């Protein structure tokens, strides 16, 4: 069923080479080679986690016969009110060790051992502000002691949390900011979704002035709304049998925002 195949495809996800992802990877290679700790910040739909998964899925783990894996980059995501044990538990599991019951110092000692054993160069912590205030002592320690670039990813609240501890603030001072699309850059990006992501049977001409007004007012420049609006409009218009997106059907999806 050709319709149902497109509804099963379009509700999926992709990664697109965009300037704001290519920029991050050139920057994170700089921090990894230089071993310098830093932070990535910006508004919640700019696509920072996709840009970091595109980094983790490049730089693949290397396998040597019967050795533990050599893992250049670690990406973890903490749970809410993450304590020192929960950070160490996750780093240990990500490098493929099972964590056995122990005191906080057993988890600390085993984590330091597996980070130094797996040859880790960079540790990326998503949603860094889920960390409890004391755990940053253990993150500073990992970065002081081992040759590891810690990268904190968050939004503008993360800075409101980092600024409550002088020891973290003066270490995680170097930063890159993820920004919103505009002008020619929003215009050019809409064409990339039409031709690389949506795969509709005839051109929808989404970059035209009568259509960019609709899409501009809907998306505000957020890449996370652009992908959401254009998948929802494609799913909906195919279930009505059109080979395109058009003015009225896109205004139906945008009127939900």
């Amino acid at each position: 069923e050709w319709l149902q195949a497109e509804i099963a495809r379009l509700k999926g996800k992709s990664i697109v080479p965009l300037q704001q992802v290519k920029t991050l990877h050139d920057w994170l290679d700089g921090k990894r080679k230089a071993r310098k700790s830093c932070r990535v910040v910006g508004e919640s739909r700019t696509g920072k986690t996709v840009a970091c998964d595109a980094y983790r899925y490049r730089h693949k783990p290397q396998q040597e016969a019967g050795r533990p894996p050599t893992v250049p980059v670690v990406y973890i995501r903490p749970h809410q009110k993450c304590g020192p044990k929960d950070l160490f538990k996750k780093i240990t599991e990500y490098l493929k060790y099972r964590v056995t019951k122990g005191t906080v110092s057993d988890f600390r000692d085993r984590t330091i051992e597996v980070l130094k054993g797996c040859g880790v160069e960079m540790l990326i912590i998503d949603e860094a502000d889920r960390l409890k205030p004391e755990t940053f002592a253990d993150v500073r320690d990992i970065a002081e002691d081992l040759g590891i670039a810690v990268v904190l990813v968050g939004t503008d609240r993360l800075d409101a949390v980092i600024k409550r501890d002088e020891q973290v603030l003066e270490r995680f001072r170097a930063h890159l900011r993820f920004g919103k699309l505009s002008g020619e850059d929003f215009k050019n990006t809409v064409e990339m979704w039409e031709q690389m992501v949506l795969k509709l049977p005839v051109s929808s001409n989404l970059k035209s002035k009568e259509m960019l007004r609709i899409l501009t007012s809907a998306t505000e420049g957020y890449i996370g709304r652009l992908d959401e609006i254009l998948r929802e409009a494609a799913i909906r218009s195919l279930s009505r049998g059109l080979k395109k997106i058009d003015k009225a059907v896109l205004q139906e999806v945008a009127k939900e925002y």
């Binding site: 999926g12 996800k13 990664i15 080479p17 899925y57 396998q63 690389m196």
Partner: peptide, 14 residues
């Protein structure tokens, strides 16, 4: 220019 399926990236990973 190349675009990636987020599940193909998962399948290709270590």
């Amino acid at each position: 220019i190349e675009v990636w399926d987020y599940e193909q990236l998962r399948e290709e990973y270590g």
